[PDB]
Amino acid sequence: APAPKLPPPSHEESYNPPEYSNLIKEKFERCLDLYLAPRVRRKLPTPSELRPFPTRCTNVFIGHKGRVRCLSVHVSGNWLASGGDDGVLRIWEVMTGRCVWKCSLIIQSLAWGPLSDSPVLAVAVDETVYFITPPIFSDEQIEASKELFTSAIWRRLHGGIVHATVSTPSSIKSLSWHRRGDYLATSSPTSSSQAVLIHQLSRGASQSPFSKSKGSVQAVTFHPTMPYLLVATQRYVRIYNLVKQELVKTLLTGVKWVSSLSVHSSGDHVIIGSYDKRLCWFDLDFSSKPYKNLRYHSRALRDVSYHPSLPLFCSGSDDGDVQVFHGRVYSDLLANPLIVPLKILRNHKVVDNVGVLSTCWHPKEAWLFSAGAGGEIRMWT
């Protein structure tokens, strides 16, 4: 017979502590509990020494009068091109913060070229993509970029040096560049049959590499060690081998809606940002299931980005908080990737219930560029 768990003693209530007609009722309640109430008998990640961490924002770029949809940094690391719903493309000097290129020429996204000698930017406006080479660079760079190219149709102003406009049936949402700079991946969620298009600049042609697509495509990117194309659909993440035109792997995110994806430089790890306030770490050699799930954000998570060199990655959500994680990856089979929280950057505004829309990492050092809905760019150092 387990004990009836004797009631707690007096709680220091008395004639005058600085902290009875009902007595029969409590006693009756105690007697009731004696036969009616059931009786039941009852590591260290050490972030200090591994501090590739940054800290609070130091440089604030202002001049956007609307939400900044997407921003990117050139390979040289000194040019930061940003764009938003205003249609104004602004190129910023990272060290000084000047807005040297004020020419505007909605901007869904814009991406730099991988080739340093060919600074060409693919900028998406509605269903049209412009290949812009600003005259801020030396002249020989413009000629060097021209010979790169000089379904979707190709067509050949305050310094509007436009090269090849690409018109697509649907409004492109995501842009990605191949490592060699010859392939451009453009994705639109609205369409289906032709949701994603691959553009070969050297051949000057566009095609749909997919005969039949399942699920709406949210984003796309290129593998960093191989030509594989990572297609982030609404619920799945599918790996496609393009040279043999087939499907390699399918990642079961366990997510109602996938927002964005980022790829480790080693190519064996994928991080999935979700509208379900979840960051999904996938180890391609571990499982099609997520290796880790993280649900720290209070609102829908918008963007996830891995630093190309340093073992840090970040997640930007609509709550205005940017979550910075340290992810260490070893080539060993025993060594599972080490994911640890490092910082939670705050003090970012939310407009129309929209927060951190896009986050980008400096190619060299631990500098994070965050775009808000108020038109502000934060450079967390």
């Binding site: 003693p9 007096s10 220091e12 008395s14 005058n16 990640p45 880790k292 799930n293 993280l294």
Partner: protein
């Protein structure tokens, strides 16, 4: 002591003899679900 409890004096409160790095430590909740036992930290 009588002076404390003389007739009409003050009464001390009657006591019942029955009555008897931090940021990272608090925020380390990796994917654990049921293993998350912050219920104890929220009550105790």
């Amino acid at each position: 002591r009588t002076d404390l409890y003389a007739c009409g004096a003050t009464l001390p409160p009657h006591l019942s003899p029955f009555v008897k790095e931090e940021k990272e430590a608090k925020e380390l909740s990796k994917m654990m679900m049921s293993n998350k036992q912050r219920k104890l930290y929220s009550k105790l």
